[PDB]
RNA sequence: GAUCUUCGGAUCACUUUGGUCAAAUUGAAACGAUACAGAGAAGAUUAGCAUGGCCCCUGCACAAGGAUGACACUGCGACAUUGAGAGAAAAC
């Protein structure tokens, strides 16, 4: 019922592993797009408050 | 002017200007730095060769390099609808 605790750790890591997908370094491009969107939103908001 | 000629004249020669543009802030390029992230292949470290072109850089080069040079690598509707029921409406 409580099969110690390290197995919970490995189960959590396995669960994160099985559904991670999306490669490994594809996480850079989407983040860069999000940051560019944030910066352009800030620029536009600054223009409208001006 | 030189030559003859006979003091009438004839010979000899005959139209430049290489202009990225008028004495340098405002018409020959391409950027330093600081501040942000900050190094490809489904755990982790990592060899590379390619594909695409209004992306180039180094090179004498159709060698080869520049992170495998970099960017890109997805995704949807010439679907005909009927198959049926129900409440409505207009209709077997
Ligand atoms: K490499
Ligand atoms: Mg190469
Ligand atoms: Mg390449």
């Amino acid at each position: 019922i409580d099969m110690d605790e390290d197995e919970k750790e490995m189960l959590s890591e396995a669960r994160a592993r099985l559904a991670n997908t999306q490669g490994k370094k594809a996480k850079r491009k989407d983040r860069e797009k999000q940051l560019e969107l944030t910066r352009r939103l800030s620029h536009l908001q600054k223009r409208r408050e001006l």
Side-chain angles (χ1 to χ4, degrees):
Chain A
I1 307 299
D2 66 357
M3 74 286 287
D4 191 1
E5 207 281 310
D6 62 14
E7 80 303 336
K8 284 163 231 198
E9 296 177 354
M10 74 158 160
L11 278 170
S12 64
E13 306 211 355
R15 288 179 186 119
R17 205 62 31 71
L18 291 180
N20 171 258
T21 77
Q22 211 198 347
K24 288 205 290 281
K25 292 326 157 198
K27 322 306 160 295
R28 326 180 52 96
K29 306 323 276 177
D30 51 355
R31 184 161 29 246
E32 289 176 351
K33 290 183 289 294
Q34 170 94 331
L35 275 293
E36 200 280 330
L37 183 62
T38 56
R39 287 175 185 270
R40 177 64 180 86
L41 279 167
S42 179
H43 198 217
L44 181 149
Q45 292 297 77
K46 175 260 288 185
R47 168 208 198 288
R48 72 175 69 245
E49 67 91 9
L50 192 63

